[PDB]
């Protein structure tokens, strides 16, 4: 019903969570009906689904402008790493590379103790007859559905015996649930293709030109979450349970799934389906193999601060492009008995040569193989997943596209798909460490500060064609590499303490006992029973084109993940959670990190229960936050803790929350909100004597959300590019009476000039011909999308600080006297407009203002 | 609740199906319930804590 | 219109018939529709020009 | 019509209502039914000529 | 200039597995046009 | 367009080869010529300016 | 002090015939606690 | 005062741990091997309780 115009028109209400949850629900409903996913080209629908763009119009104002020509244009934010660039496995030489990490994080996911609640189902005509067999004394009239017309089918009497023997609970209580496998499918697709903005390294300059078309499969025993597979025919599998119960028996049915010792019944006609290898995955533990880009030279690109696109990044030779598939670890079933039904004693395993099914064809012409060999990993079978296998993107996703097409149409309901989308949105994206730039303090307060010099943190760029921003002063050493590797976050802000490292000729992984989350297991009994047509199908359709296709679903989960990130950033600027509380040294710099985590988890736990509907501890935990280690020789930058956990720019946060930061909140004219701040020294001489305005309290913002809009554009200044001196320092400072040295500056989480140059294109494609130059460029500002300073510098203590004038001739209530940014969301992507800001002199005569004043 | 409404259901034994496994096999069998359901059967019958 | 009312029809999969070919074979199969119907399926679902 | 019933509903022995094996190598056995369900599904769903 | 690739329907079908994709791939092949043989001879 | 240039007071020398080196007034006149053209195109053509 | 015996669910099942008794036996084994793997790492 | 009291509780306890693989490592003490988990010398499925 509602549209983007209605959402952009309205702002926050005093109950935020009842407002934010409803807004996110409406945004998801809008994401459902958006087209542009079926008729469009293949690698344009994929790029629109997985790399959504958020339009916005920037602009800044000045005090005394005389014929100032500005450009009103539209940019497109986008955030999230689409892949990860590391050094290749055969580098050696122990030398830094321009954008090549020595290792990558591993967001390991455990097994949930909670079980997804199954919903009712109805039996097939054959299933109802099994129910009659189990419910009544035997009679020949009970056998009503079985037949022998079709040979070796799912409708004879031996299938009836199977159903009555190993699936009695499901005959008595027909029930199923499919959200775990759907979650794993969504995560697999998203991680293989890569969501986000196209940035594919720890440096904000290297991007990914487009979605890759060719992958390579790599095997690594040391750092693979592999699971064991056994292959049997139904006859041999049943025969192995005759002379007692062997150890690790999968014979008894399962109602609450347990990690190890699972089994699945696979009909012979469905083994050959391309969906079978992906169905054995998405329920097993992963990743059993690593997926790389075939070529990192024709896919990775470099973006300059001014918008110059250089295709071959300096060190293409010694770099690998890991997909997000390799940055995630999932725990599923560790041992699976694949039992094939409707198969004689010469089956022959179709996929991998040298693999023999127990009870099938033997090695050399023999029949009824008598060995139940256990295969470690899904790569030992399913020849498509062997080592060094080059696959096209269509020949790898197709089976997935098949699997999702069947379950969502024949096996699962819409509620399961919605729950799967909501759960998978929690692990959808990976964000790099948050960079910040402290502006310093005015020279007037040089003697009243502990943080005088400007500084920067986590500001890393690798482009060398254009001018490098002075804020970016990060050199990729081993210690800095590890410190930033321990700094990536998930949509809810959870870090990871598990890492991997593959170089020289050695692969080594450190997986901690603490996990970033947990996922439910898929009950393989439901899968097996559905796959033998024991349950009645939910729908008679054949295609999911008109209802919840894989690409639209994945687009929905990516949208929900970006919404989770934006709302988490908003909650960070609701509980006064500093950015530095999520760095590598978060556990030793200050003991207030736990206090901040308390309020942050209070916000998150209320959001998850009100919107997601799943157990909160499975999606967010403090286990990885509290298990920080700190590298060693990495020192914290001298920056006060005054900025929140901003991971996505301000326009995305305003889109997902309704925050308004237009030019109506910038004061130009003027009754007494001012206060004179007086300070004397030991000689009794006044040394400050400056006007100031009190920063608003969170209660005041709660009762009036325009106070937060006015707080922005009062402490916000455009970030300079060539010099480390801001135009806000010359006029204003932060005065905190409770501090020993009461003056400070502004922290301003800072993305990049290259990153924002990547925002110019409406679609995340950058090869050579895309024009990333700023619109109507004339002449040194890096754009401010940073969220205002926190209204409180303590998670629990409420105290009032001030914005204090620094020169003499600036009155803080007369409006800011620098380059003051303003933002808008904008639905319709318009073109560049050359506007002029002038003085009003009562003789202002322009043709447009004279003749185009009708409307 | 699944286990409770399961073991409370009326069956007809008959050696064709698995309900008869409480007779041909020890009464502590997990082929009608689950293994966890068989283990927690007394407490499923009387849920107290 | 034949293709549209075709792919919109309710089937029961079952490996006996060919409706099950969207499962046992890739979902871009032409054994239920025609080859042209499979190719123009997205545009048959949304006819615009 | 029996092939239509096969393609429209889950398998049951009552669905097989017209086939017979009285006449050998005729157009009325079950393999002809498989042929109709395999290579002529569109024309079963939309009988047209 | 732009690059053209001329095939027949039977030959174009055999390029892929057995059927041609609903969405044309990246590489030429950026666009695809289906012309009946009766319309090719038109001016 | 010529009439709008007269109405917006756009000199004829703002469209020569030296429109950018002569004097910044060219861009100041463009800042009104663009408004005139944008209004006309949004009111008549209906396409993006 | 008290005596502790640590197993896994699959290994604990294989001690007995095929399933574990509803009532724990006498000998250690005087008490039995079932912990999901996600709760073991808790403080 | 912890040292000044004496309580009588369970004397024998079986810690079971459900939902774990055969390579499970006890995360609280080095040299402690879970029955059915990781063995002493990198082994799997430890056989002693």
Author numbering:
A (entry chain A): 70 to 739, 743 to 851, 854 to 929
B (entry chain B), C (entry chain B), D (entry chain A): 197 to 245
E (entry chain B), G (entry chain B): 295 to 321, 328 to 343
F (entry chain B): 637 to 685
H (entry chain B): 393 to 441
What do the authors say?
The double-stranded (ds)RNA virus Giardia lamblia virus (GLV or Giardiavirus) exclusively infects G. duodenalis. ORF1 expresses a capsid protein (CP) that assembles an icosahedral capsid. The GLV capsid comprises 60 copies of CP dimers named subunits A and B (CP-A and CP-B) in the triangulation number (T) = 1 icosahedral asymmetric unit. The overall structure of the GLV CP shows a typical α-helix-rich α+β fold commonly adopted in the Totiviridae and other icosahedral dsRNA viruses.
The first high-resolution capsid structure of two GLV subtypes was determined using cryogenic electron microscopy (cryo-EM) single-particle analysis at a resolution of 2.1 Å and 2.6 Å for GLV-HP and GLV-CAT, respectively. GLV-HP tends to form aggregates and accumulate below the trophozoite plasma membrane and inside the cell body, whereas GLV-CAT does not form aggregates, is scattered in the trophozoite, and does not accumulate in the cell body. Hence, this C-terminal interlocking is identified in two directions in the GLV-CAT capsid: CP-A to CP-B and CP-B to CP-A. The C-terminal interlocking includes the same amino acid pairs as Arg671–Asp922 and Lys774–Asp927; however, more intersubunit interactions are identified in GLV-CAT. In the CP-A to CP-B direction, only two possible hydrogen bonds—Arg675–Asp928 and E872–N917—are present in GLV-CAT. In the C-terminal extension of the GLV-CAT subunits, similar swapping occurs structurally on the Lys902 residue. Notably, Phe320 in GLV-HP forms intrasubunit interactions with Val184, Leu590, and Asn592 in the CP-B; however, in GLV-CAT, the corresponding Leu320 in CP-B interacts with Asn112 and Gln282 residues in the adjacent CP-A. The switching between the intrasubunit and intersubunit interactions by the F320L point mutation largely contributes to driving the observed structural change in the variable loop. The Phe320 or Leu320 residue in the CP-A is located near the 5-fold axis, which might also affect the observed structural variation there. This additional CP–CP interaction, which is mediated by Leu320 and the variable loop in GLV-CAT, should make the CPs’ network in the capsid more robust. With the more robust C-terminal interlocking in the GLV-CAT capsid, the capsid assembly of GLV-CAT is structurally distinct from that of GLV-HP.
